[PDB]
Design a binder for these strands. Structure first.
Lengths: 77, 206, 60, 263
RNA sequence: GAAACUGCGAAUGGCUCAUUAAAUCAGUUAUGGUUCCUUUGGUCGCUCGCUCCUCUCCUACUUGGAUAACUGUGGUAAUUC
RNA sequence: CCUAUCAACUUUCGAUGGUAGUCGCCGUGCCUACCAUGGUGACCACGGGUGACGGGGAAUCAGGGUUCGAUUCCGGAGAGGGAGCCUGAGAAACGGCUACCACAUCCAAGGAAGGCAGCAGGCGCGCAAAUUACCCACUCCCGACCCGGGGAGGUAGUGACG
RNA sequence: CGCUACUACCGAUUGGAUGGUUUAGUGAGGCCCUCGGAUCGGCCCGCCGGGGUCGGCCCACGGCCCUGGCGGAGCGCUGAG
């Protein structure tokens, strides 16, 4: 499905997330909201998995898992 | 759909088989005819490998054979008195192979009296009065002597047969599948078999 | 709607546009076989008996 | 799946004794349905353009057939992959040449010209002799030809001269000990010889002890023995390679001696 | 001779090995337990006269009547509608 | 093939058998009545696992063995997942159908049409794998047919698997 | 006993996720089966056109019969539906 990720840093880009979400199955694509007028990575991302099982697994784990000294928040989009 | 295979169910060992392929047209195993008693309809059905199979829905006539005289006559089948496959079949009046049915006495008796030119006895008062007497008199003027020489130990037939004539119906056994053949044909019960079926009919009732 | 009225003696057919409610309404709740009177539509369909035969809805 | 029978056969999966190539063509001719089984058959095409070499395309093969210059068994065929078999005669009516198919003991189908006298008839062994419907008798030959009212003393494994002008039985030869046989299939392919003894075993499979002309003795199943006439009385000639049996050493000596000695 | 009806192919072909542990499958056997178009070979007048309606059942020098393609009018935002 | 840190198992929704019937192209607990209490295991059953399709075959080994097999051929199986069905001798068929479920598409919002584990190609995936090409002339297959159609198949291109 | 790093274990949160089995309930769809008659003709009763016969050998138009046309009566009664 599509899952939303929030509480991203501006030092956390698509590439940093790409390796992070591989133990929860292979991502199809990682879209990340950027605005270059203010900041870099706004704070919201949308990761798109190919399969429904893989997507749900991510939401469960990643929520409570630390990455760059912040608690990532993941939830169904 | 409705199914018929050996690659399902339990093993000898107490194991369980796991499928071989997915249901196929050959396995089809069509629902029952459920043919009973009422006005005749039969339908032609297209079945596997080509060929035509009759599906009977309602039958009420059969071709019942008198096996000790080697003649078969087409008669009514009015009811199921006994069936040994299931008791319910009798009650519901569903015709299946080996149903013990009731057929008319009168055509078999009429055939015998005419053919042998002497009556078995007297079936009934009503039966006697217009003809039976006619047959006894003979239409042979002339060739009376020929009949007497020809027929020895007649003016009678076997005890079991005579007893059934008195009842006004004869017990008969269905010797064909009424739902697949489309024929409810059978042979008239006689000797030991008739005695046994009457014993069963009496045993079950009451 | 447009009535596709055919005279089958001549083998002809034509459309006509009738949007007048009274002229139409006569043919409503008729089923394909039933006769109707076409007198409603004018003098030129007066004395005509019409057998409804079919047609097409909206969305085809 | 598999929802029905194949209508194709690949090459390099066809029977060896047809003498096709390996992988240089990806499809074999495949016999049509007919009187003989596809293993033992020889599609018309292989005979016509691979042995007698009258075509170098498939386009030509179809065009040849449509001329209808070819009769097979006295009857007029036009099938591109006709399922000819054992002692089936091919009749070219444009050249007056009659060829029959009989095994080499090498195991290769022989191109074996016969006279039009010997192409009048062929000897066919009875497969079943059948009391048919309404008490009319029939014999049925191996090549699935049913002849009604057959001679009233015949019994199983008899041979029967079938005639191809007019059909029907044109006498018969009775099955007896010491009859000529050609043993077909197996490890005894294309060998000719007498009988000697037929051993009978109740239940399936009965073996027939054969002795060949050389004096090599062997058994095979009755099924693999085909009766081709009366003992020491051929009705068609021996084919190339002896048709009896020859050793690989002898065969080498023939191959080198004949080659560069002709022309 | 476009078309259309009719008949046949369309189950074959090609692809991939997920599934399944005596299941599949291999080799050896069976169908006397059964179905099979086609091809190849036989089987092609008749009711054996309803003790000839079939000499009157006298349509045999041959019966009955409807759809396509076609022609015309059309509907649908969009359909191999 | 591996497993006892799987030792008892199979029928109340038949487990095995007798008898009789329904049903099926046809055998048969296939299904059902009635009637029996069977059937199977330390010679590993039963249960669990499995990148577990099977064979012909492949690689290395003195010999003995060990390892490999989706993959040019043969058999079986499936065509997004399930279930049902029509045609036909043969199909429970995705370049047929129908429903639902998961996916995707058009929409004027009423509706409507769909299945590349076919050939090319693209996306995703990864350490990993090619032309959106040309042709039915060959090789064969199909048809009413020599005549037509074929991503069957041939042909080139890509190609330091080797 | 101490720095540092990895791993298995136990763990509040009756943490979360996914897949397969499960009682019971509900149950699409098709198939089978009991019905139904939306629908259309056919064979019979009016007028005619032809033929024919029992108005009429003027046996001819026509009535009447047959069949075609067309409507109506019972829509009677068979088949399809």
């Amino acid at each position: 499905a599509t899952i939303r990720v929030t509480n991203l840093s501006e030092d956390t880009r698509e590439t940093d997330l790409q390796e992070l979400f591989r133990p929860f199955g292979s991502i199809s694509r990682i879209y990340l909201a950027k605005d270059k007028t203010t900041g870099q990575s706004k704070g919201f991302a949308f990761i798109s998995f190919h399969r429904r099982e893989d997507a749900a697994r991510a939401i469960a784990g990643v929520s409570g898992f630390g990455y760059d000294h912040l608690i990532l928040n993941v939830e169904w989009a | 759909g409705i199914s018929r295979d050996n690659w399902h169910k339990r093993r000898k060992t107490g194991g369980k088989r796991k499928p071989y392929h997915k249901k196929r047209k050959y396995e089809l195993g069509r629902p029952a005819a459920n043919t009973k008693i009422g006005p005749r309809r039969i339908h032609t059905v297209g079945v596997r490998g080509g060929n035509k199979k009759y599906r009977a829905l309602r039958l009420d006539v059969g071709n019942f054979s008198w096996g000790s005289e080697c003649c078969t006559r087409k008669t009514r089948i009015i009811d199921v008195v006994y069936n040994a496959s299931n008791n319910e079949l009798v009650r519901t009046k569903t015709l299946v192979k080996n149903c013990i049915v009731l057929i008319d006495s009168t055509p078999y008796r009429q055939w015998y009296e005419s053919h042998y030119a002497l009556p078995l006895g007297r079936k009934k008062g009503a039966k006697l009065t217009p003809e039976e007497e006619e047959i006894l008199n003979k239409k042979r003027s002339k060739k009376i002597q020929k009949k007497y020489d020809e027929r020895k130990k007649n003016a009678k037939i076997s005890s079991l047969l005579e007893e059934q004539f008195q009842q006004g119906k004869l017990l008969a056994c269905i010797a064909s599948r009424p739902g697949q053949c489309g024929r409810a044909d059978g042979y008239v019960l006689e000797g030991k078999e008739l005695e046994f079926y009457l014993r069963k009919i009496k045993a079950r009732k009451g | 709607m447009k009535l596709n009225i055919s005279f089958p003696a001549t083998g002809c057919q034509k459309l006509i546009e009738v949007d007048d409610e009274r002229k139409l309404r006569t043919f409503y709740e008729k089923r394909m076989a039933t006769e109707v009177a076409a007198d409603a539509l004018g003098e030129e369909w007066k004395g005509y008996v019409v057998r409804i035969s079919g047609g097409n809805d909206k969305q085809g | 799946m598999a929802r029905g029978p194949k209508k194709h056969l690949k090459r390099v999966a066809a029977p060896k004794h047809w003498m096709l190539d390996k992988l240089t063509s990806v499809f074999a001719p495949r016999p049509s349905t007919g009187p003989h089984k596809l293993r033992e058959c020889l599609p018309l095409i292989i005979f016509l353009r691979n042995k007698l070499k009258y075509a170098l395309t498939g386009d030509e093969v179809k065009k040849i057939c449509m001329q209808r210059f070819i009769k097979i068994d006295g009857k007029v065929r036009a099938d591109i992959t006709y399922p000819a078999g054992f002692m089936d005669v091919i009749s070219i009516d444009k050249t007056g040449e009659n060829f029959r198919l009989i095994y080499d003991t090498k195991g290769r189908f022989a191109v074996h010209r016969i006279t039009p006298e010997e192409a009048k008839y062929k000897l066919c062994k009875v497969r079943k002799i059948f009391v048919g419907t309404k008490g009319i008798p029939h014999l049925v030959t191996h090549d699935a030809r049913t002849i009604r009212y057959p001679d009233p003393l015949i019994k199983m494994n008899d041979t029967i001269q079938i005639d191809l002008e007019t059909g029907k039985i044109t006498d018969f030869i009775k099955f007896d000990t010491g009859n000529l046989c050609m043993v077909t299939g197996g490890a005894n392919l294309g060998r000719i010889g007498v009988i000697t003894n037929r051993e009978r075993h109740p239940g399936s499979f009965d073996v027939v002890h054969v002795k060949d002309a050389n004096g090599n003795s062997f058994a095979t199943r009755l099924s693999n023995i085909f009766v081709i006439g009366k003992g020491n009385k051929p009705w068609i000639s021996l084919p190339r390679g002896k048709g009896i049996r020859l050793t690989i050493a002898e065969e080498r000596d023939k191959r080198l001696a004949a080659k560069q000695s002709s022309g």
